[PDB]
Design a protein around this ligand. Sequence first.
Ligand SMILES: *[C@@H]1O[C@H](CO)[C@@H](O[C@@H]2O[C@H](CO)[C@@H](O[C@@H]3O[C@H](CO)[C@@H](O)[C@H](O)[C@@H]3O)[C@H](O)[C@H]2NC(C)=O)[C@H](O)[C@H]1NC(C)=O
Ligand SMILES: *[C@@H]1O[C@H](CO)[C@@H](O[C@@H]2O[C@H](CO)[C@@H](O[C@@H]3O[C@H](CO)[C@@H](O)[C@H](O)[C@@H]3O)[C@H](O)[C@H]2NC(C)=O)[C@H](O)[C@H]1NC(C)=O
Ligand SMILES: *[C@@H]1O[C@H](CO)[C@@H](O[C@@H]2O[C@H](CO)[C@@H](O)[C@H](O)[C@H]2NC(C)=O)[C@H](O)[C@H]1NC(C)=O
Ligand SMILES: *[C@@H]1O[C@H](CO)[C@@H](O[C@@H]2O[C@H](CO)[C@@H](O)[C@H](O)[C@H]2NC(C)=O)[C@H](O)[C@H]1NC(C)=O
Ligand SMILES: *[C@@H]1O[C@H](CO)[C@@H](O[C@@H]2O[C@H](CO)[C@@H](O)[C@H](O)[C@H]2NC(C)=O)[C@H](O)[C@H]1NC(C)=O
Ligand SMILES: *[C@@H]1O[C@H](CO)[C@@H](O[C@@H]2O[C@H](CO)[C@@H](O)[C@H](O)[C@H]2NC(C)=O)[C@H](O)[C@H]1NC(C)=O
Ligand SMILES: *[C@@H]1O[C@H](CO)[C@@H](O[C@@H]2O[C@H](CO)[C@@H](O)[C@H](O)[C@H]2NC(C)=O)[C@H](O)[C@H]1NC(C)=O
Ligand SMILES: *[C@@H]1O[C@H](CO)[C@@H](O)[C@H](O)[C@H]1NC(C)=O
Ligand SMILES: *[C@@H]1O[C@H](CO)[C@@H](O)[C@H](O)[C@H]1NC(C)=O
Ligand SMILES: *[C@@H]1O[C@H](CO)[C@@H](O)[C@H](O)[C@H]1NC(C)=O
Ligand SMILES: *[C@@H]1O[C@H](CO)[C@@H](O)[C@H](O)[C@H]1NC(C)=O
Ligand SMILES: *[C@@H]1O[C@H](CO)[C@@H](O)[C@H](O)[C@H]1NC(C)=O
Ligand SMILES: *[C@@H]1O[C@H](CO)[C@@H](O)[C@H](O)[C@H]1NC(C)=O
Ligand SMILES: *[C@@H]1O[C@H](CO)[C@@H](O)[C@H](O)[C@H]1NC(C)=O
Ligand SMILES: *[C@@H]1O[C@H](CO)[C@@H](O)[C@H](O)[C@H]1NC(C)=O
Ligand SMILES: *[C@@H]1O[C@H](CO)[C@@H](O)[C@H](O)[C@H]1NC(C)=O
Ligand SMILES: *[C@@H]1O[C@H](CO)[C@@H](O)[C@H](O)[C@H]1NC(C)=O
Ligand SMILES: *[C@@H]1O[C@H](CO)[C@@H](O)[C@H](O)[C@H]1NC(C)=O
Ligand SMILES: *[C@@H]1O[C@H](CO)[C@@H](O)[C@H](O)[C@H]1NC(C)=O
Ligand SMILES: *[C@@H]1O[C@H](CO)[C@@H](O)[C@H](O)[C@H]1NC(C)=O
Ligand SMILES: *[C@@H]1O[C@H](CO)[C@@H](O)[C@H](O)[C@H]1NC(C)=O
Ligand SMILES: *[C@@H]1O[C@H](CO)[C@@H](O)[C@H](O)[C@H]1NC(C)=O
Ligand SMILES: *[C@@H]1O[C@H](CO)[C@@H](O)[C@H](O)[C@H]1NC(C)=O
Ligand SMILES: *[C@@H]1O[C@H](CO)[C@@H](O)[C@H](O)[C@H]1NC(C)=O
Lengths: 118, 453, 48, 48, 48, 127, 126, 126
Amino acid sequence: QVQLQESGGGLVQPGGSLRLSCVASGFDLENYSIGWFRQAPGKAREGVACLSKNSGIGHSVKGRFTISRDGDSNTWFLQMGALEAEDTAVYTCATYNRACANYVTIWPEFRGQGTQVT
Amino acid sequence: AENLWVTVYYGVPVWKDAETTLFCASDAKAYETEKHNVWATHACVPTDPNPQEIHLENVTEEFNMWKNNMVEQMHTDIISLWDQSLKPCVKLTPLCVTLQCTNVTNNITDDMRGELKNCSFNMTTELRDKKQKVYSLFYRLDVVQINENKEYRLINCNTSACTQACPKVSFEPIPIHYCAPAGFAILKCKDKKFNGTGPCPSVSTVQCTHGIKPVVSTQLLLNGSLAEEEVMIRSENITNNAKNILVQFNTPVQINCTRPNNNTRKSIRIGPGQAFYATGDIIGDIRQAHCNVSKATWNETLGKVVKQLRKHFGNNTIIRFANSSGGDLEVTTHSFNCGGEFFYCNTSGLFNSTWISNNDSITLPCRIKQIINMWQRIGQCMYAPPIQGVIRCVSNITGLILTRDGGSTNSTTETFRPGGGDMRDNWRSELYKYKVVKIEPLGVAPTRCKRRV
Amino acid sequence: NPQEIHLENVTEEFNMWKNNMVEQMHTDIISLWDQSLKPCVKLTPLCV
Amino acid sequence: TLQCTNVTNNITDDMRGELKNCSFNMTTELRDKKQKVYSLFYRLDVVQ
Amino acid sequence: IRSENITNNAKNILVQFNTPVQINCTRPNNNTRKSIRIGPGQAFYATG
Amino acid sequence: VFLGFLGAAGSTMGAASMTLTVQARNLLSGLTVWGIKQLQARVLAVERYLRDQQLLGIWGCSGKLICCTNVPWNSSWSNRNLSEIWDNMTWLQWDKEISNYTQIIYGLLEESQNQQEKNEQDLLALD
Amino acid sequence: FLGFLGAAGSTMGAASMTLTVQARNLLSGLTVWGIKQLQARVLAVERYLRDQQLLGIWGCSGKLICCTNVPWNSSWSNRNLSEIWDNMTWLQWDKEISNYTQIIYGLLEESQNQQEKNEQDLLALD
Amino acid sequence: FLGFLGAAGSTMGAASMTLTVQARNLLSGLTVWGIKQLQARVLAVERYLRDQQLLGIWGCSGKLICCTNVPWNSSWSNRNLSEIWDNMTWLQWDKEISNYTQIIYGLLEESQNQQEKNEQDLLALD
Ligand SMILES: *[C@@H]1O[C@H](CO)[C@@H](O[C@@H]2O[C@H](CO)[C@@H](O[C@@H]3O[C@H](CO)[C@@H](O)[C@H](O)[C@@H]3O)[C@H](O)[C@H]2NC(C)=O)[C@H](O)[C@H]1NC(C)=O
Ligand SMILES: *[C@@H]1O[C@H](CO)[C@@H](O[C@@H]2O[C@H](CO)[C@@H](O[C@@H]3O[C@H](CO)[C@@H](O)[C@H](O)[C@@H]3O)[C@H](O)[C@H]2NC(C)=O)[C@H](O)[C@H]1NC(C)=O
Ligand SMILES: *[C@@H]1O[C@H](CO)[C@@H](O[C@@H]2O[C@H](CO)[C@@H](O)[C@H](O)[C@H]2NC(C)=O)[C@H](O)[C@H]1NC(C)=O
Ligand SMILES: *[C@@H]1O[C@H](CO)[C@@H](O[C@@H]2O[C@H](CO)[C@@H](O)[C@H](O)[C@H]2NC(C)=O)[C@H](O)[C@H]1NC(C)=O
Ligand SMILES: *[C@@H]1O[C@H](CO)[C@@H](O[C@@H]2O[C@H](CO)[C@@H](O)[C@H](O)[C@H]2NC(C)=O)[C@H](O)[C@H]1NC(C)=O
Ligand SMILES: *[C@@H]1O[C@H](CO)[C@@H](O[C@@H]2O[C@H](CO)[C@@H](O)[C@H](O)[C@H]2NC(C)=O)[C@H](O)[C@H]1NC(C)=O
Ligand SMILES: *[C@@H]1O[C@H](CO)[C@@H](O[C@@H]2O[C@H](CO)[C@@H](O)[C@H](O)[C@H]2NC(C)=O)[C@H](O)[C@H]1NC(C)=O
Ligand SMILES: *[C@@H]1O[C@H](CO)[C@@H](O)[C@H](O)[C@H]1NC(C)=O
Ligand SMILES: *[C@@H]1O[C@H](CO)[C@@H](O)[C@H](O)[C@H]1NC(C)=O
Ligand SMILES: *[C@@H]1O[C@H](CO)[C@@H](O)[C@H](O)[C@H]1NC(C)=O
Ligand SMILES: *[C@@H]1O[C@H](CO)[C@@H](O)[C@H](O)[C@H]1NC(C)=O
Ligand SMILES: *[C@@H]1O[C@H](CO)[C@@H](O)[C@H](O)[C@H]1NC(C)=O
Ligand SMILES: *[C@@H]1O[C@H](CO)[C@@H](O)[C@H](O)[C@H]1NC(C)=O
Ligand SMILES: *[C@@H]1O[C@H](CO)[C@@H](O)[C@H](O)[C@H]1NC(C)=O
Ligand SMILES: *[C@@H]1O[C@H](CO)[C@@H](O)[C@H](O)[C@H]1NC(C)=O
Ligand SMILES: *[C@@H]1O[C@H](CO)[C@@H](O)[C@H](O)[C@H]1NC(C)=O
Ligand SMILES: *[C@@H]1O[C@H](CO)[C@@H](O)[C@H](O)[C@H]1NC(C)=O
Ligand SMILES: *[C@@H]1O[C@H](CO)[C@@H](O)[C@H](O)[C@H]1NC(C)=O
Ligand SMILES: *[C@@H]1O[C@H](CO)[C@@H](O)[C@H](O)[C@H]1NC(C)=O
Ligand SMILES: *[C@@H]1O[C@H](CO)[C@@H](O)[C@H](O)[C@H]1NC(C)=O
Ligand SMILES: *[C@@H]1O[C@H](CO)[C@@H](O)[C@H](O)[C@H]1NC(C)=O
Ligand SMILES: *[C@@H]1O[C@H](CO)[C@@H](O)[C@H](O)[C@H]1NC(C)=O
Ligand SMILES: *[C@@H]1O[C@H](CO)[C@@H](O)[C@H](O)[C@H]1NC(C)=O
Ligand SMILES: *[C@@H]1O[C@H](CO)[C@@H](O)[C@H](O)[C@H]1NC(C)=O
């Protein structure tokens, strides 16, 4: 398998946009939803996005970040814009509950490795 | 004497785990002065006047509640009933017209600033060509702002079409008993130490399950069945973050819930025969609906839950609570079904406390929503018609679906946050002590018989 | 050629005002008409 | 009705006509507004 | 060779082969499908 | 007495084999949901009972509850004393004890009944 | 006489002549009339199968005409045998045992269980 | 062994050796394959039940081989005994008697009724 593979990390100038993405398989990605992490040095774990199944809504903790999907392709796109100096961390995409249960605070199972955004 | 020969026994008390399909068993009440039901019990067979339970001895039957199929069967059945009940009445697609909505300030209160909206729109009369300017009141949750007097639009009207909830039918929960067909037995565990996965050396056979109310709620179970002795904790892993903890109370907690506004329903014609019921002209003051629990009862209940929960997490561990941290509007909030009006309450006045090693009331604000998406399969929305008068609901709120937080390695900073998700734990707390066994009557055994020719 | 066994020596208490066939047929004919009216035209646009 | 016209981008002599570059009005999600959508329709699915 | 009446001019002759005949064919064209809105909820995919 | 469905399901086979009628009598109890849904269960119950009854009738059996039979026990499926089996073990334990060797037993019973019928025919025709 | 259910008016003794005739027609054989017919078929099969199981619970196994224990208690009927078998029709007779059948249907069961137990004990002791 | 319907072409005497295996799978077992599959199941049940009732009220119920009365009328088949059983097949036998096998199903019934008469009378006399 269920593990998640992420891509799109790199260096961004302040005031740009990114196209973080992550894909997965494992014959069990119909019961779970996929959201994203955010872990900056010195601080705890937050959340950035959670594409809830059963509602199709693209919840996010800030206005800039948006999660999206496309068809039946098992890939999820995190689009981030108007980046600023604090948004430099280790972005990981993980699996949350079927209806995007408590995130920005939870520590899920079946998580990825995480790219680097500076 | 050596001729120990095989004989065959039929109708022997032997069972093997298997799966089948069950049916209704509802109290008749003579079913004459009834206004139908969403779980139509006219087609349901009547329950036994005096169901009999047979206690079994010497028996240790393995039980399990997390791979039970009864919950999946229940969920499929109730979803099918809900879909069936929504067919034979109004199918209002002609409501996605461009609504022109203003605020409402007929002596409003500041807490409910905005919220209710005065919407007006063109609408087709009985004739196919003539149009009329009609008006209604729409809650802030059911309208979005297109073309950013502003122009609003129904929230469901790019992604689904709503069939208005049928005015004659009712959503009032009634008990239903699931009775296995002939040849299958229902085993029920009577052990007070029962927790889920594990044998129960008190299993008794029953004709079928007790009366269970198919209620719909999130993060706070309502009219559940309490477990005696003490509050019980069940899971599928107490050590996994992504798994709920179906906490079951032993002392019921009274919760009142109101809506102190009148609602003058005004049916308006939108086509031939089809009539759509709407709000309008609230009589008297308008105040937001609220819910009351008792702080004295809730504080003690949370203390008991914490005392029972520190068993699985150590006696020197902090235990903190918090509200839901995000999700849909049906997981971070209570999800009532109170008299045909679907509340959505602010359950953050309860889950805010910290517990260490060593008269009054709590008021939760609620946000009424009409356009709902229960049975969250996309494209099956439904418009609940407004209900006239001031309504009240009383419940025992015997349940909890807290999820752990975890993840910070090994430490004592455990926090619990309510959260639902898949709509199966409202019945996994009612069909936990139940299983279906297929009876196998055939059985061979050796005796000294010779089978005279 | 349906059979008709005439029975002798038998008396039976009939009832025409409590019969069940007279009600089952009544529901059945309505069911027939409702089924036969589905698979063709359902003209709404005559309200002009 | 389709205000269709005949497609002539990177076309081949064998596939003359055939595809048609149709433009028609269409109700949007709100049942009060007309878009102007376009599509490609083979010559076997459109008649004059 | 199978036929109901092989001496008839209106009966099909279902020839069945001994060795298969490999046949390929394609549609050597990308067809970009764009979704447009029929109305509330319903969608319609048309080749772009 | 100790009536009720599966009333003696935990008691030993000695006392269990007195009220098999209780366990066998209620095997035939009795478009929208709760419609065809109940009817499917009814048909399945009839199917299961018919399977059991035909399986009983195929062998030389179907008196009712108990039916003595030929083809001696192989004495390999259970190397246990008769008294211990019939007064020290409950029925489910016996089931899990000999659940691996059922099909061969059923085939043996079928063949024994057929051979008995052939013997009866031979001993009835000649006289 | 002849025909299905063609002797309901005849005497009790004479009506025990066409038991096969009445037993044969107990098993005759989406859309309207397409689910009612199937429901009726299932109901008829279930009724016949329950009746056959009830017959087989007691030791008859041969259906028509069965001999059994549980002697006729004088409380159930107080009258001569030839009067029962010579003048009544079966419908009239069923009136006299409209309410006495429940005890009989268990008395026959316990008699059958006793006989089976005696048979098993006799075969075991040998 | 020869599977289900395996001995179909075998000779009559050898065909009457594997009755059980071919009498063992007579009960094997909304949208399409919904009501129609259940219809097939119900039809199979009804057919088996009718066959069992015939093997019943005839006087048998032990299935497979069954002795019975009603001596073989010569009109049905004027042939030897061995020729029926050594160089004939059950299908050929069924073709041989197809219209005759309807009066037999009544002669057996009457023989069963008279046998039950005799048994009942001799039992009640003593
Ligand atoms: C959990 O159970 C309680 C207890 O049944 C539910 O409260 C019940 O709510 C219904 C709906 O309003 C009440 O019925 C109404 O009663 C009024 C006053 O009698 C009547 O005018 C209405 O026509 C309607 O019949 C019902 O009385 C009330 N129960 C009690 C004991 O007062 C509650 O709704 C359940 N929880 C959920 C989430 O459904
Ligand atoms: C659910 O319940 C919680 C309970 O606290 C709500 O949280 C509170 O929401 C208000 C919204 O205005 C937050 O703003 C506060 O407003 C007062 C009004 O004067 C102001 O004085 C404060 O300085 C503050 O700005 C408030 O911080 C927040 N928390 C608390 C403890 O009050 C929540 O809004 C409810 N709804 C949802 C969807 O969560
Ligand atoms: C209901 O229909 C009438 C049709 O007359 C709409 O009237 C229009 O109103 C706008 C501003 O409110 C004017 O600019 C137009 O000229 C009016 N149309 C006319 C006069 O033909 C009315 O807006 C509709 N109600 C709505 C959309 O809520
Ligand atoms: C319950 O949860 C535990 C841990 O939360 C599960 O065991 C884990 O299995 C994963 C599978 O890759 C391992 O990576 C972890 O290391 C395991 N945890 C530990 C502590 O060893 C377990 O499968 C879950 N289910 C049950 C029935 O225990
Ligand atoms: C909501 O809007 C309706 C429609 O405009 C309001 O009803 C109007 O009220 C004024 C006086 O306040 C009358 O002059 C109009 O004739 C009314 N129009 C109609 C169509 O009835 C209504 O007052 C607004 N507020 C509420 C709370 O309903
Ligand atoms: C849970 O409670 C916290 C505070 O106890 C809420 O956080 C506030 O949320 C509102 C609206 O979302 C903001 O205006 C405040 O600034 C937040 N304050 C803090 C300190 O975070 C949170 O919204 C509550 N969540 C739910 C689902 O009720
Ligand atoms: C879509 O609707 C517009 C609405 O105006 C149509 O435009 C008119 O078309 C007719 C001919 O069909 C002309 O005579 C008018 O002058 C047009 N009016 C305007 C304002 O342009 C249009 O034809 C419809 N169909 C399409 C494919 O666009
Ligand atoms: C009118 O409602 C809107 C909600 O979209 C709100 O922003 C605005 O403040 C309201 N106006 C008044 C006067 O309350
Ligand atoms: C249409 O519905 C979607 C839900 O899929 C929502 O995100 C959006 O705000 C709605 N309105 C649009 C796209 O204008
Ligand atoms: C339930 O209790 C049994 C008792 O031994 C235990 O083994 C099992 O782990 C428990 N399950 C839980 C706590 O989820
Ligand atoms: C609702 O209207 C009725 C009828 O006038 C009135 O008696 C009642 O008081 C109103 N509701 C409230 C809460 O006042
Ligand atoms: C809930 O409590 C508030 C607290 O003042 C009270 O005003 C309201 O009437 C209560 N509602 C009830 C008891 O239904
Ligand atoms: C809920 O309302 C009932 C009836 O008015 C009352 O008896 C009870 O005290 C209320 N509960 C609380 C917690 O106020
Ligand atoms: C009530 O709740 C508070 C919340 O922290 C807790 O400290 C206290 O121990 C609880 N019990 C009492 C009797 O106050
Ligand atoms: C939540 O709890 C904290 C401390 O326990 C307290 O300061 C705060 O006022 C509480 N807020 C609510 C809404 O209960
Ligand atoms: C709620 O709790 C009370 C407390 O005794 C109980 O009588 C009642 O049956 C429970 N359920 C409901 C629906 O009121
Ligand atoms: C497009 O080209 C074909 C080629 O002959 C022509 O027949 C057809 O009429 C053309 N379409 C239009 C709309 O003129
Ligand atoms: C099939 O073969 C038979 C063999 O005699 C022949 O009579 C019949 O006409 C053939 N059918 C065809 C060739 O369609
Ligand atoms: C087959 O075709 C011939 C051609 O004339 C015709 O005479 C004969 O009747 C046909 N037979 C059948 C069975 O179609
Ligand atoms: C069709 O387009 C895709 C990208 O849109 C491209 O990868 C592919 O090569 C194109 N088809 C052919 C035959 O080149
Ligand atoms: C349970 O087992 C004990 C073991 O000796 C036995 O004495 C007792 O009778 C059994 N209980 C029953 C059969 O109800
Ligand atoms: C029969 O059950 C399993 C099936 O493979 C087998 O491993 C087991 O050894 C058998 N039972 C006994 C008692 O040996
Ligand atoms: C009716 O009774 C008479 C004698 O009273 C008898 O002769 C006659 O046969 C009976 N009817 C039938 C159909 O048996
Ligand atoms: C078929 O008949 C031949 C003789 O004609 C015989 O040898 C053979 O055994 C028969 N087949 C079977 C399966 O008995």
